[PDB]
Design a protein around this ligand. Structure first.
Ligand SMILES: O=C(C1CCCCC1)N1CCN(S(=O)(=O)c2cccc3cnccc23)CC1
Ligand SMILES: O=C(C1CCCCC1)N1CCN(S(=O)(=O)c2cccc3cnccc23)CC1
Ligand SMILES: O=C(C1CCCCC1)N1CCN(S(=O)(=O)c2cccc3cnccc23)CC1
Ligand SMILES: O=C(C1CCCCC1)N1CCN(S(=O)(=O)c2cccc3cnccc23)CC1
Ligand SMILES: O=c1[nH]cnc2c1ncn2[C@@H]1O[C@H](COP(=O)(O)O)[C@@H](O)[C@H]1O
Ligand SMILES: O=c1[nH]cnc2c1ncn2[C@@H]1O[C@H](COP(=O)(O)O)[C@@H](O)[C@H]1O
Ligand SMILES: O=c1[nH]cnc2c1ncn2[C@@H]1O[C@H](COP(=O)(O)O)[C@@H](O)[C@H]1O
Ligand SMILES: O=c1[nH]cnc2c1ncn2[C@@H]1O[C@H](COP(=O)(O)O)[C@@H](O)[C@H]1O
Lengths: 332, 332, 332, 332
């Protein structure tokens, strides 16, 4: 019998590693952190100066965040928990502030196609087909329909996935980037409510095995707690990281300042929380107030630059080839 | 020598996984959670609408709980810590409330046979031969005697087991379902008192390897803390889950409301606790008050439906074929 | 290279398991706990009714404890942190209370031989050559000299060891029992002071591999926190367990009652603590007051009997053949 | 696919062990702790009486610490966070106190060469090329230039490294000792800021595999919390240990006494902390006040002597050949 039970070796398919399970190994380097090139592909056509995008959540990204992210060299993805006209108006607002990149989330419901076209009319650069489980005919069809209809002018992101097969299906459907993360978010309760999830280092490694041979970039979405996790996500093969919790405490995020026990916080809630939907798969929580976005991004990029120095990675493409050491429980 | 000591590779027979050690992997899906079929075999003949049964404990299941469980599409198993006439009267009470399924626990003591016949006379549908260790001639004989005597009209459950050999012995004795769980209960101290136990994912996988080829359903009993654990238990191959702690805080469970530190609780105690027996293998504890049973069951089934959506499982039989990823300590 | 570093596979010699790493697996059983035979060899010639002996520590075993242990069916080992005449007087005191077995500790210093002879004159049954590291010529010589001089009338225990080679050396020197435990004691700081130790399940398995083929019993000494650990120690192949912390809180142990924060305690200190020696390898601590020894022993034996029921072990010799499942961090 | 994800077995290059992951196994011994020889090579030419050196940090080592360390039989490495003239004056101060060994840190900036020559003029014995990542042409060139210019009179240490390849490069450049530790320091945030690091037992094992065949000693730098960790570091193959946190609380370290909550502390800060640089990779913290250095060193050496007794190591060279057992999470 299999050592963990039963007679089927495939029943437990893999050992899933998360960010805390690994560290980047130093390697021969003549790269100064200040001189590293942090640019990376968000999609097949769109390259960002900083490999970071903000989550499509209503306590993270509206027009103010999207503008600040683009100015910092990344991009915002506008959330879709609002009327079509209002989302498209936020797209226009971002475009009014110069030649700034912006993305926007759409679902696969019956209002989704109309939402997508209105966003297109407003001048959006990236449409994100925004689901918790992309390995589904309705999601794949939406990605494909969008790519064939507006694909010349707009890049189409599909997600989320956590397996190689799912990433492969999105590639076949025509996705310009594949977003990875089922279960890892800081406000996520999918693991305890549904018992479903996939540790994010292993999910990225698997998704990249399907996407990289087709020249399709992977966006690592969820579970990033520290700037060092961004370096780990990219070294596992992702091309960008999408951040929720790490940006939710910034001045530019939606929501007001909250004072509890003499300390400052902002509300941060899952799009699957009871509040956002009003069976919940997210919580409503708090994150410490962090000040201006520009400063948070500077600290995050700073940690990434340090990782590039330690690993001898002159570019993000080189960082994607770095090696890990796996650590034990004691290592934490 | 064996890496963990000695010269005998069989001394440490297996690596035992519990619920927290695994997550369900998403798979290709065209299943909507609302449309998933949650029905499953409790026994060879009896199929439930919801794959959940309440524990035969005196702080979990008497007539009120049994009626509410059956109305919710599951079933109650009436505890046996009371006189024969009173248990049989609870069976009659459940039957007075319509065509509701009900089960009842019996032991293997010398009063057990008389208890079983009185329950039969009262119209019980399921007899549960209710022990902490079923791999024992007296237990196997009781299962067999019951099956040969009342088996045409009543389904006979045997338990508990934690090994493949034990499950196989119950199958041979004629059990209509095999109940799995030695040591995993939330109020259990068997692990620290006797040093005995078996992590429940591995126990289910092993029991199912003996039971499934004979068409005998497995009931996963104990250690379930979250709705996601129900999905994991079924994916490991169980057909139903038996719940104690998760239902002990409901309005329909026996016992009164307790207020401590401004919060509401109900008493929840092991049938092996000093109180229930009045060498203890259970504690007397508290669980948070949860409100009506119907609402708890709705939340639990909701999480199960989400898991079925993520895994592409249209039925419980399909969910039994889902795959796991094993996670590390950091993953918790 | 070796996965954990370097080029030498023997540098990290084994994976060491402690009690918390394993559980006993249930097995086919027709053993009632009340009818199990708990007798076991303390030494080649001496069989105890209960397989438990009290530690040779000055907060655990003086005459009162030794008498109570023998009456309970086990044995006490009198500590040696006192003058020779006083230790021998405690031996006489135990013998005055009927035909009770008693042991006594000796070191390997230059006063050790005289201590041993005085204990012999006083009628001791067991001499324990009592060291932290028995794999040493001076210790082996002391064991051998004792066995050749007083071996017809007195059984000679040697310890402590944690490796197969060390246990083998004691067997060759003529030990009648081998005591296992380097580093596992509850009050031990050897692991953090010296960085030395050996997880106790693996140490027992290794020692037993050297001792059992020569008919020499193993005493598991240290690290036992629960009655279930006694069952685990014996199933790993030990014949008896030596208890310090679990007995230090009893009425019969030396020392007075201590009240802190409204709760009752007794002092419990390592023989390697600064206080006992007045570079420390033990701490001075507290254990909860537990009441009479007889009651503690009854609870401990109760847990052992339960384990024998679950595993189908009619005797301690059968329990030594039981199997384990290894558990994960989540299992704790 | 690889069990942890992707198709590349080299992506996760190793399983990294830290000090808490292992224990030293006892072995046959006729070594008394008091008689063990604790001397060891700091560099190819310089042997210390005690195998300990103090960190080049401005809350650990200035002239007072360096003098006390040398008197205790070890050595201090003077920090370089001060003007060249002042560092060289501290070297002179140490030399004024007798024939005491002293080292001093230099960087690889454009002021580094002038700093090195001024230290040479002041009579320093050891120059430590002091970086966070030595596998870099500028660092290797500095080591080589120093060795070829002042190598007859001064020993040249290079560091830090965490891989076999990096240690090999320093050996080739002419280093007289290689210092190991990237990420393990108690005040380090490199692991969370950059996601970079290497568990220290594995790092030492790897570095030693490159250095020992060339007769180059390894200094284990960082992560040592207990005296037992010193024994583990040396048994992994290091020849000396460099201590920061363990010495930062001593009377001889720079800084004043701090009283918080009725207890005494001293400030201890990373050289990568915001305070020391005024993207931080260290924190500013506190350590308990420990009293005189001589006493701390005596306790540390005491633990080392105990380890040498347990392992039968008469010399540090013998201790370098000792074996480990790997422990589990439960073992902690
Ligand atoms: O559509 C579903 C699933 C229902 C069950 C069957 C599969 C689909 N939702 C479940 C909850 N999410 S969410 O807001 O919590 C969510 C949104 C973005 C990404 C996430 C990744 N992992 C976990 C949750 C995620 C939104 C809707
Ligand atoms: O009959 C026994 C054993 C005595 C020792 C030898 C084997 C049988 N009992 C032990 C305690 N249990 S219990 O109430 O705690 C209990 C009841 C349902 C299932 C459980 C599963 N695992 C653990 C305990 C369980 C009832 C009686
Ligand atoms: O003789 C020694 C060692 C000194 C270093 C070299 C090897 C021998 N002692 C060390 C401390 N112990 S102790 O009291 O702490 C002690 C006593 C019984 C058993 C124990 C098992 N593991 C750990 C400590 C133990 C007594 C003397
Ligand atoms: O030069 C660098 C790196 C910048 C990023 C690219 C590689 C080099 N520094 C980073 C921080 N350190 S430190 O003070 O924190 C430091 C100093 C001694 C040893 C250490 C070992 N591990 C971690 C930190 C260490 C000083 C400068
Ligand atoms: O309610 C929720 N439950 C689970 N995941 C969510 C929810 N809302 C958003 N997410 C995902 O979690 C990401 C943010 O993760 P974080 O950066 O760890 O906080 C988001 O980009 C989503 O992919
Ligand atoms: O006293 C006890 N000790 C150990 N297990 C018990 C005891 N009483 C009931 N059980 C079992 O634990 C199950 C409930 O587990 P729970 O849902 O985790 O609380 C019950 O259905 C029994 O199988
Ligand atoms: O000071 C000490 N340091 C380490 N081990 C000790 C010391 N004193 C006694 N021991 C051992 O620890 C055993 C008791 O362990 P315990 O039952 O876990 O408390 C004793 O029988 C000794 O073998
Ligand atoms: O700011 C820092 N961040 C990371 N490592 C540092 C820093 N400052 C000094 N170190 C290293 O950590 C060692 C001290 O580690 P410790 O003994 O565990 O406190 C020092 O000798 C340095 O190698």
């Amino acid at each position: 019998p299999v050592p963990t039970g039963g007679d089927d070796p495939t029943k437990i398919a893999m050992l899933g590693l998360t960010f805390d399970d690994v560290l980047l190994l130093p390697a021969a380097s003549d790269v100064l952190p200040a001189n590293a090139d942090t640019s990376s592909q968000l999609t097949k056509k769109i390259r960002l100066k900083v490999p970071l995008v903000s989550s499509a959540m209503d306590t993270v990204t509206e027009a103010r965040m999207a503008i600040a992210m683009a100015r910092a060299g990344g991009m915002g993805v506008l959330h879709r928990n609002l009327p079509v006209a209002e989302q498209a108006a936020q797209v226009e607002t971002v475009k009014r502030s110069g030649g700034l990149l912006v993305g926007a989330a759409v679902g696969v419901g019956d209002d989704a196609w109309e939402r997508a076209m209105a966003l297109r009319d407003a001048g959006v650069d990236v449409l994100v087909v925004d689901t918790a489980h992309a390995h589904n005919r309705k999601v794949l069809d939406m990605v494909h329909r969008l790519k064939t209809t507006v694909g010349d002018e707009i890049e189409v992101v599909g997600g989320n996935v956590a397996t190689r097969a799912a990433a492969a299906a999105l590639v076949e459907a025509g996705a310009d980037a594949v977003k990875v993360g089922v279960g890892p978010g800081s406000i996520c309760t999918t693991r305890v409510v549904a018992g479903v999830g996939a540790p994010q280092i292993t999910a990225i490694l698997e998704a990249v095995a399907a996407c990289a041979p087709h020249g399709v970039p992977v966006i690592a979405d969820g579970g990033l707690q520290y700037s060092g996790d961004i370096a780990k996500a990219l070294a596992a093969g992702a091309s960008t990281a999408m951040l929720g919790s790490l940006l939710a405490g910034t001045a530019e995020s939606p929501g007001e300042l909250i004072l509890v026990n003499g300390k400052q916080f902002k509300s941060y809630r899952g799009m699957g929380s009871l509040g956002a939907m009003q069976v919940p798969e997210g919580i409503e929580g708090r994150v410490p107030f962090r000040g201006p976005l520009s400063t948070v991004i500077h600290q995050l990029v700073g940690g990434l630059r340090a990782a590039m120095g330690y690993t001898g990675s002159a570019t993000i493409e080189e960082l994607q080839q770095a090696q890990f050491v796996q650590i034990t429980a004691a290592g934490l």
